[PDB]
RNA sequence: GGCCGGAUGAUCCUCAGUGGUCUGGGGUGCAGGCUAAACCUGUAGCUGUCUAGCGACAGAGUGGUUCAAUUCCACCUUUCGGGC
RNA sequence: GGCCGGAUGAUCCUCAGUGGUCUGGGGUGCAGGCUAAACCUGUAGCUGUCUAGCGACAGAGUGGUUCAAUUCCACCUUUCGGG
């Protein structure tokens, strides 16, 4: 959520940066006009019955002076000082100015709904160095590779993955219904030890690991995703509501697609000190998303499917100086440092805003290279939402306001990942266990992975 | 689900002992007589049908023969002389007596399914036969120390390590919600990589399964009460495409067993290794109606949590089944004991128990901070109810297998557990076993950051 | 946990009043006439809206009652108490 | 991706035929005969009901036209052919 006085010309900001910073994001316009709208229209109703109520406070004090001493015409708008007139006068306007407030009350009652309404939906001040385009295939602006991304091997992920024998693909989609999928022996263990290493490493960096809730109630949810999100992403989940037999009500609520969301209303509605404001999250979550935005795109394999487990960088910053932008260098080059010390061919590419949503202003998602299917796969993605979350979760740094900025980058998709180490480690007899990973790995798989199976691709 | 042949005083078996197994279950019978009514009626309508259809075949046989507008006689006999004009009027009559039993037929299969979903498993001789768990569970042995307490609850040892924040839990779950955090989750993290490599030590296939299961298979693997009082619902697109605007509904898992039992449905399975053993890692789903005010500020009763699992196939013939059982809690109780913590097997009563299970020994754990014992194990032999139900099968008589689940460990429950019996004045000692999977720093034992 | 209670949120702090737009003892600190201390006056925070600005007006938990509520009442957040 | 064409499911292989509860030519696994192979003859998978048992009847993806649908049209899923 974006500031309101950066509309408002009387202030310092101007919405015609907002329009261009909208067509730059590629979401259609117009709402800003409906947001200037609303909110000059909310600034008329306001005016309007903080009028109303002076004057409603001007008739009683005539009332009470009038009434020391003792003991049928309009005029709206002009409201003098004007003593002389009757309490029976004075107390049949009352009425009149009771449904006058009222309407208004309607008036401003939809006004800020419909302003929250279309401010739900603008995104997030893009950083000039992100590329302004619509099509990532073409405009992305690599900056950055390591490794050895000339080599390959032949063997999808699709297939190891069976040859290994950790995958009953067939069985799942009986019971999850489509991509579903039974992780099973071995690929468990390298998992497990994924999870293991990448925690670990996250704690000798100086991250606090955090196991998060995986559904969020409704109401906080709404206020951490777009509606999108909502639409073609997270899984709804009816629950009771109340843990009485009594109790035949509900109460809606969403499945995670990240530990961003439950790390980032973990301080909702906080004061938070600068003497610690460098606050980092490791955040360990299952993430659950739909991803009906896709269909037909790699379904034998595991690499997109609807459950797994992923460790999060989650980390509250100061707004001051770039140092926000400062600790978004470092945390992308922790991940750096991380996907390197695997030894994994990779390349940092800079998303255009055509595909960045509403609440980041730059997002660099970085690629891995896949030997075995001779491609590059999004296997991270950094963001930097600044106080765009921080302000719709109310999060405070006197006087003047100022919100902090909020960031997060998925340290480890463990089950991408595990397709990634899966096509770069393979011999002729299995897949050898990187030098780091053979610490947590079980004698007997310590050495490499074999195949008791083949290729999953016979024919006639 | 019991076999059908069970209730037909025909074949080997009688309801009189089924009514018996529901009185002892402290159901109330009479959905016997209504299996069995029901039942007799679809063996009745079934011979309407089948002699319905013999005479639409005898028909068409004159119609063929025959042929190589006269109304006759009344409404089966010898077939002969009789117009083809004639023969052909009563094919209609016919049709819709046909028609009228179909639907008497489909609603009798139902009726019949609807009773039979909700009849237990026959229990085992050594099952205490009473309702009340608090009296008449029959202790079957102990180990460790149960006999020493330390005055620290769980409750508020979990805030002094400073590895837990409850009130925005509730903030963002809605009550009983959490954020473990920091050296708990190592330590959680601790306990399922031990306890995996513990298994895989024994010879268990260890794997992670789906957390939600469609519709139509959970039906078959739980009862109603589940679905009343424990199971999250979850709506879904039901289809990966921007045009379809319709919906699928699911339910989340409260065990791994459930999505292991429906991993071999509908399947032929091999004597040659019919020893099948499997440790189902899952995150478990409950929505614990059942209870409120109930442990509401730990976290031993909760919505969510982490939670491996032993699952069994086993093979029918003989007890070997039980057999196997035995050698699982024997596991576990090797497990446990391994880990150092007191502990004592108790023997749950028929009341208690639900419709799979045939026999359910549960293990109870000594809280020296608490001072009690809880509920950390649940073993179960669900025999071939499920196996039947998800039709699992064994020439010729057909045999379905029997099946078995036990929980290995309860990450968070267990965590409880650990936190108040390896207690120090500084902190939590960290097990000798569990010192080997730790980091640096808590390797020796997790501190205390904040009073209590 | 239960009642019966009190306090309570947003005018510098505190005790307390009072249905008349508020009053008063008393207090820390602020500006200064005035004779380190003493005595007098005066001032006091946040949000929203209006103006370029000085400035003004509108808000005091959600509501009810009344022309009008800080007070009379209801109910909620938190806090203490006669207590069990 | 959508078009003019391909098969399906539940009858041991296949070929084709064919509105009458199917037919015929030839080839895998049991059984039997004559005497290694050939040849000769019968059978075949599952479900449900009925007699206590022999055995028989009912079911072949769902649904219309026909008395009768392997046969002729409609629909479902999957997998296959040239583009
Ligand atoms: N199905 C998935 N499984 C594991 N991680 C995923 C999955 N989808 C997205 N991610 C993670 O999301 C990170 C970056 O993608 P993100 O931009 O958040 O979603 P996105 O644009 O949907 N990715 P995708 O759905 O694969 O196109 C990746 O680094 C992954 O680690
Ligand atoms: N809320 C829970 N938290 C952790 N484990 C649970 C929970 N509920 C059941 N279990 C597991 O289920 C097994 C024993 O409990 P179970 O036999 O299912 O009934 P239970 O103890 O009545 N359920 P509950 O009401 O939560 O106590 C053990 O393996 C437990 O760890």
């Given at each position: 959520?974006?500031?309101?006085?950066?509309?408002?010309?009387?202030?310092?900001?101007?919405?015609?940066?907002?329009?261009?910073?909208?067509?730059?994001?590629?979401?259609?316009?117009?709402?800003?006009?409906?947001?200037?709208?609303?909110?000059?229209?909310?600034?008329?109703?306001?005016?309007?019955?903080?009028?109303?109520?002076?004057?409603?406070?001007?008739?009683?004090?005539?009332?009470?002076?009038?009434?020391?001493?003792?003991?049928?015409?309009?005029?709206?708008?002009?409201?003098?000082?004007?003593?002389?007139?009757?309490?029976?006068?004075?107390?049949?306007?009352?009425?009149?100015?009771?449904?006058?407030?009222?309407?208004?009350?309607?008036?401003?009652?939809?006004?800020?709904?419909?302003?929250?309404?279309?401010?739900?939906?603008?995104?997030?001040?893009?950083?000039?160095?992100?590329?302004?385009?619509?099509?990532?295939?073409?405009?992305?602006?690599?900056?950055?590779?390591?490794?050895?991304?000339?080599?390959?091997?032949?063997?999808?992920?699709?297939?190891?993955?069976?040859?290994?024998?950790?995958?009953?693909?067939?069985?799942?989609?009986?019971?999850?219904?489509?991509?579903?999928?039974?992780?099973?022996?071995?690929?468990?263990?390298?998992?497990?030890?994924?999870?293991?290493?990448?925690?670990?490493?996250?704690?000798?960096?100086?991250?606090?690991?955090?196991?998060?809730?995986?559904?969020?109630?409704?109401?906080?949810?709404?206020?951490?995703?777009?509606?999108?999100?909502?639409?073609?992403?997270?899984?709804?989940?009816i629950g009771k509501g109340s843990?009485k037999?009594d109790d035949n009500s509900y109460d809606?609520?969403?499945?995670?697609?990240?530990?961003?969301?439950?790390?980032?209303?973990?301080?909702?509605?906080?004061?938070?000190?600068?003497?610690?404001?460098?606050?980092?999250?490791?955040?360990?979550?299952?993430?659950?998303?739909?991803?009906?935005?896709?269909?037909?795109?790699?379904?034998?394999?595991?690499?997109?499917?609807?459950?797994?487990?992923?460790?999060?960088?989650?980390?509250?910053?100061?707004?001051?100086?770039?140092?926000?932008?400062?600790?978004?260098?470092?945390?992308?080059?922790?991940?750096?440092?991380?996907?390197?010390?695997?030894?994994?061919?990779?390349?940092?590419?800079?998303?255009?805003?055509?595909?960045?949503?509403?609440?980041?202003?730059?997002?660099?998602?970085?690629?891995?290279?896949?030997?075995?299917?001779?491609?590059?796969?999004?296997?991270?993605?950094?963001?930097?939402?600044?106080?765009?979350?921080?302000?719709?979760?109310?999060?405070?740094?006197?006087?003047?306001?100022?919100?902090?900025?909020?960031?997060?980058?998925?340290?480890?998709?463990?089950?991408?990942?595990?397709?990634?180490?899966?096509?770069?480690?393979?011999?002729?007899?299995?897949?050898?266990?990187?030098?780091?990973?053979?610490?947590?790995?079980?004698?007997?798989?310590?050495?490499?992975?074999?195949?008791?199976?083949?290729?999953?691709?016979?024919?006639?």
């Amino acid at each position: 959520v974006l500031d309101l006085d950066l509309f408002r010309v009387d202030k310092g900001g101007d919405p015609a940066l907002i329009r261009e910073t909208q067509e730059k994001r590629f979401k259609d316009p117009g709402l800003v006009d409906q947001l200037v709208k609303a909110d000059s229209e909310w600034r008329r109703c306001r005016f309007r019955a903080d009028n109303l109520n002076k004057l409603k406070n001007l008739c009683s004090k005539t009332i009470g002076e009038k009434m020391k001493k003792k003991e049928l015409s309009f005029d709206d708008l002009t409201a003098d000082a004007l003593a002389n007139l009757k309490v029976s006068q004075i107390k049949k306007v009352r009425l009149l100015i009771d449904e006058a407030i009222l309407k208004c009350d309607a008036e401003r009652i939809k006004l800020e709904a419909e302003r929250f309404e279309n401010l739900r939906e603008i995104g997030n001040l893009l950083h000039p160095s992100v590329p302004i385009s619509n099509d990532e295939d073409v405009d992305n602006k690599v900056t950055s590779i390591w490794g050895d991304c000339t080599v390959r091997k032949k063997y999808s992920h699709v297939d190891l993955v069976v040859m290994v024998d950790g995958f009953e693909g067939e069985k799942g989609a009986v019971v999850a219904g489509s991509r579903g999928y039974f992780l099973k022996g071995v690929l468990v263990f390298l998992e497990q030890a994924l999870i293991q290493y990448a925690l670990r490493t996250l704690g000798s960096r100086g991250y606090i690991p955090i196991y998060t809730p995986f559904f969020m109630r409704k109401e906080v949810m709404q206020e951490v995703a777009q509606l999108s999100q909502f639409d073609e992403e997270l899984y709804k989940v009816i629950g009771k509501g109340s843990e009485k037999s009594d109790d035949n009500s509900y109460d809606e609520k969403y499945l995670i697609a990240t530990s961003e969301q439950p790390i980032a209303a973990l301080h909702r509605d906080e004061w938070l000190r600068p003497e610690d404001l460098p606050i980092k999250y490791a955040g360990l979550s299952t993430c659950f998303r739909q991803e009906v935005g896709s269909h037909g795109r790699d379904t034998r394999g595991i690499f997109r499917v609807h459950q797994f487990e992923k460790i999060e960088q989650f980390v509250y910053s100061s707004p001051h100086d770039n140092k926000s932008w400062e600790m978004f260098e470092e945390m992308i080059t922790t991940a750096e440092e991380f996907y390197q010390s695997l030894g994994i061919p990779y390349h940092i590419v800079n998303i255009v805003s055509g595909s960045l949503n509403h609440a980041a202003s730059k997002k660099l998602d970085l690629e891995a290279w896949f030997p075995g299917s001779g491609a590059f796969r999004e296997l991270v993605s950094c963001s930097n939402c600044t106080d765009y979350q921080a302000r719709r979760l109310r999060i405070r740094y006197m006087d003047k306001v100022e919100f902090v900025h909020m960031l997060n980058a998925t340290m480890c998709a463990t089950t991408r990942t595990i397709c990634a180490i899966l096509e770069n480690y393979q011999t002729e007899k299995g897949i050898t266990v990187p030098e780091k990973l053979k610490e947590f790995m079980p004698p007997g798989l310590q050495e490499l992975i074999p195949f008791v199976k083949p290729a999953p691709i016979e024919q006639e």
